Amino acid sequence: ALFDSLLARNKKQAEGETALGELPSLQLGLADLRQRLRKL
Amino acid sequence: SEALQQEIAKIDEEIQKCIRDKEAVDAFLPAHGEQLAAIPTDVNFVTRKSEGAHNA
Amino acid sequence: DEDGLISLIFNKKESDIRGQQQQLVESLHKVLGGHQTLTVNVEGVKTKADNQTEVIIYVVERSPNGTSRRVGASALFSYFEQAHIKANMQSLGVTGAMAQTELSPVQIKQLIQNPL
Amino acid sequence: DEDGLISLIFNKKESDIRGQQQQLVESLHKVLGGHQTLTVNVEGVKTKADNQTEVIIYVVERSPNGTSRRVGASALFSYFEQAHIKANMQSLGVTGAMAQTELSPVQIKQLIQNPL
Amino acid sequence: PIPEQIKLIVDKWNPNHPNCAFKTYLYNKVDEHTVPLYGPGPNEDPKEWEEALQRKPAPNFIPVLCSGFPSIVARLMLQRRVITEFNNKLHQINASL
Amino acid sequence: MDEIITRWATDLAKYQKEFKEQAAKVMEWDRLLVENGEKIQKLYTSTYEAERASNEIERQL
């Protein structure tokens, strides 16, 4: 249930809300993400 | 020949009676074996769900 | 419990208790109903204060077959604590009583659930 | 363990178990020696398969002082697993038994060191 | 040399321990300070006992005498009895989680 | 009559060689059991900790 909680947390993460700053972040993945990782 | 032929019977009977116990062991193994093998898979599973709660 | 010992405190001097022990024992026998199947025995007499004396008793009961045994301490205490009997005892100068049997937890629980 | 619950599997249909529950309970009482200080109680009855029924029981034991308590599950299981008792149980249709108490490691070690 | 082999075979298949030939020792765990107890019994050779204690896997373990088949059956009996306890406790953990 | 002693001794050695294996297997199983048991206890601890922590969070909210 660990990975499940990781999903769940990363799911609730990118979904609002009214927290005065933390807006949901768009997910990338795979192609764009590798380059986004390399650009670190 | 009576005492001998009787003694061999009693002895071989006792041995056979012991081998019955040996067989009794042999019979009660595979089930118990599965039961045993089941354990580490669950504790290795429940330990995971705990990690989930802790991370939560 | 089988030893049947009941300790009684009397508001009387020891010399008075000993001086009239025959009478005291018979009065206790009367409190018990006075039948010839019961006999009060004195186990000991001890001064506790100027006008306080402890008297330890037991009661032997005889069966129809001639057999004798001591009345159990709990049974005897139960009789003496009954309100009518206690009052009669107080008229003899008894101001307290005690049994030696250490009750079990279940016995104690029963007494608390049914104090009467 | 104090709740004293033992689960029994019977090779009988549920309707048969319930239909003769008085008799079943008394037979279990007899297996225990039949004394009036022990009383078998049925906690539950559940069908498990066409001809398999689980019956959960406990046993109340009464002390000489009138106190009652449940026989501990481990103690009751230990009695029922004794070879003579197990055989009697099997004659009633019992094909298995289980206690709910999760034994400690030291208890388990003791059972393995002395399996008899 | 015939009535010797026979007696030796009758001796082998037996719990009396005259060279039982079904001699294996199993280590039962026991926490301190109970190690000083145990303490074998009727027909235990201190040789076998000490030799068992010699190649000890870990401390707080005491050896146990398994002569023949009923003993290994019994060991199994215990193993199941603990199996169920294990599963139960594990399920408790599961439930609380 | 030797043909009987042969059978006896062969059976003996044959079943000895097997009993040894059974016993060994049982031993290994015991090892497995305690090896897991330790982990079970660890789970008990970890769980109790989690429980207490959750209770604390409950108190906080």
Side-chain angles (χ1 to χ4, degrees):
Chain A
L2 172 54
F3 174 84
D4 305 22
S5 73
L6 294 175
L7 169 74
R9 188 181 178 280
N10 195 264
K11 177 264 181 182
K12 294 179 289 189
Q13 176 183 315
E15 189 250 317
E17 302 276 358
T18 309
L20 310 181
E22 50 181 12
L23 308 180
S25 57
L26 50 88
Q27 65 181 241
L28 296 87
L30 306 177
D32 298 329
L33 198 60
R34 284 174 77 188
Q35 295 187 3
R36 279 288 302 277
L37 182 274
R38 279 288 84 181
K39 281 183 291 187
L40 177 57
Chain B
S1 65
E2 183 179 356
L4 178 142
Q5 192 70 6
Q6 195 171 6
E7 179 171 7
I8 180 174
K10 180 59 178 178
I11 292 168
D12 193 276
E13 179 178 357
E14 183 180 356
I15 300 168
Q16 183 179 358
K17 192 179 184 64
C18 207
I19 301 160
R20 288 171 186 179
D21 307 338
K22 175 260 190 176
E23 291 168 1
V25 175
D26 277 311
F28 303 156
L29 285 177
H32 184 257
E34 181 179 353
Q35 288 182 315
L36 266 171
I39 288 175
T41 322
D42 299 343
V43 59
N44 188 270
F45 166 75
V46 177
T47 190
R48 180 176 173 178
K49 184 157 65 175
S50 77
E51 281 187 347
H54 280 77
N55 182 274
Chain C
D1 191 67
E2 58 195 335
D3 289 340
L5 299 170
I6 299 303
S7 303
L8 303 173
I9 295 285
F10 282 86
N11 57 18
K12 295 185 170 186
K13 307 168 57 181
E14 182 176 7
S15 65
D16 289 350
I17 295 293
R18 290 201 191 273
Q20 67 203 4
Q21 196 163 307
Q22 283 191 56
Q23 308 91 277
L24 176 57
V25 168
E26 186 56 43
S27 287
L28 291 167
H29 178 237
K30 178 178 184 183
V31 164
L32 289 158
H35 282 207
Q36 63 171 45
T37 50
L38 297 180
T39 307
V40 180
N41 290 262
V42 178
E43 173 69 12
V45 178
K46 300 189 283 197
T47 181
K48 292 288 198 264
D50 284 351
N51 299 290
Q52 273 202 323
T53 301
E54 184 179 68
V55 177
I56 307 181
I57 65 167
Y58 61 93
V59 178
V60 173
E61 62 187 341
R62 199 170 55 265
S63 310
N65 63 15
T67 306
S68 282
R69 75 177 160 196
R70 296 189 187 189
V71 181
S74 296
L76 190 55
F77 185 92
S78 180
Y79 183 75
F80 283 144
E81 74 168 354
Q82 293 312 302
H84 284 245
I85 302 303
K86 183 164 164 176
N88 288 336
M89 293 289 277
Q90 286 168 328
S91 286
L92 303 177
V94 176
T95 56
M98 185 185 63
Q100 297 317 126
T101 313
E102 280 260 309
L103 301 174
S104 73
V106 291
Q107 285 178 298
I108 292 170
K109 204 186 300 303
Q110 178 62 259
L111 289 167
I112 294 169
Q113 286 182 335
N114 196 349
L116 279 58
Chain D
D1 191 67
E2 58 195 335
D3 289 341
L5 299 170
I6 299 303
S7 303
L8 303 173
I9 295 285
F10 282 86
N11 57 18
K12 295 185 170 186
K13 307 168 57 181
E14 182 176 7
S15 65
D16 289 350
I17 295 293
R18 290 201 191 273
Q20 67 203 4
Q21 196 163 307
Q22 283 191 56
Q23 308 91 277
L24 176 57
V25 168
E26 186 56 43
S27 287
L28 291 168
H29 178 237
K30 179 178 184 183
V31 164
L32 289 158
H35 282 207
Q36 63 171 45
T37 50
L38 297 180
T39 307
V40 180
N41 290 262
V42 178
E43 173 69 12
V45 178
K46 300 189 283 197
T47 181
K48 292 288 198 264
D50 284 351
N51 299 290
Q52 273 202 323
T53 302
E54 184 179 68
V55 177
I56 307 181
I57 65 167
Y58 61 93
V59 178
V60 173
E61 62 187 341
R62 199 171 55 265
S63 310
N65 63 14
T67 306
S68 282
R69 75 177 160 196
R70 296 189 187 188
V71 181
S74 296
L76 190 55
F77 185 92
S78 180
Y79 183 75
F80 283 144
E81 74 168 355
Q82 293 311 302
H84 284 245
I85 302 303
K86 183 164 164 176
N88 288 336
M89 293 289 277
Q90 286 168 328
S91 286
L92 303 177
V94 176
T95 56
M98 185 185 63
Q100 297 317 127
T101 313
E102 280 260 309
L103 301 174
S104 73
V106 291
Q107 285 178 298
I108 292 170
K109 203 186 300 303
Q110 178 62 259
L111 289 167
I112 294 169
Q113 286 182 335
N114 196 349
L116 279 58
Chain E
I2 303 173
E4 295 183 0
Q5 297 185 27
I6 299 167
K7 227 298 183 176
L8 286 171
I9 284 179
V10 168
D11 271 325
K12 298 292 180 65
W13 301 84
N14 255 319
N16 297 12
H17 202 280
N19 309 329
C20 177
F22 295 105
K23 187 189 301 183
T24 309
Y25 283 157
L26 293 185
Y27 297 95
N28 187 25
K29 178 175 175 58
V30 179
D31 302 331
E32 290 168 11
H33 309 261
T34 327
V35 184
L37 299 79
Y38 319 143
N43 305 94
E44 184 71 356
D45 311 328
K47 178 248 289 182
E48 303 288 352
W49 183 272
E50 289 297 337
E51 279 184 2
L53 282 167
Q54 201 73 354
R55 184 44 179 170
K56 186 188 216 176
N60 310 322
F61 285 5
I62 298 174
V64 184
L65 331 176
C66 287
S67 173
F69 299 102
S71 67
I72 183 166
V73 169
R75 193 69 176 178
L76 292 159
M77 295 273 164
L78 178 143
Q79 279 187 319
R80 194 168 64 186
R81 189 178 295 100
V82 64
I83 230 73
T84 54
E85 200 258 15
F86 260 74
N87 282 316
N88 288 10
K89 288 169 64 176
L90 198 26
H91 179 248
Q92 181 60 25
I93 275 57
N94 165 79
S96 57
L97 286 168
Chain F
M1 191 263 287
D2 300 332
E3 300 184 358
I4 301 167
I5 298 172
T6 59
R7 293 156 196 166
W8 284 3
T10 43
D11 288 326
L12 178 143
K14 172 164 65 182
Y15 291 172
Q16 175 181 2
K17 179 261 184 177
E18 192 174 356
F19 164 83
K20 300 278 182 177
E21 171 57 25
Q22 288 181 345
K25 202 139 57 181
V26 173
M27 200 188 304
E28 218 294 321
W29 282 344
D30 277 291
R31 182 175 74 82
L32 184 65
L33 266 157
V34 294
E35 183 180 336
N36 290 124
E38 291 184 344
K39 217 185 301 304
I40 300 294
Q41 287 303 135
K42 288 189 177 182
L43 262 62
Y44 256 101
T45 308
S46 179
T47 300
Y48 286 166
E49 181 183 337
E51 190 173 354
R52 295 165 55 267
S54 181
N55 276 319
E56 181 59 27
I57 298 165
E58 205 297 316
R59 195 196 75 174
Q60 290 297 333
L61 289 172

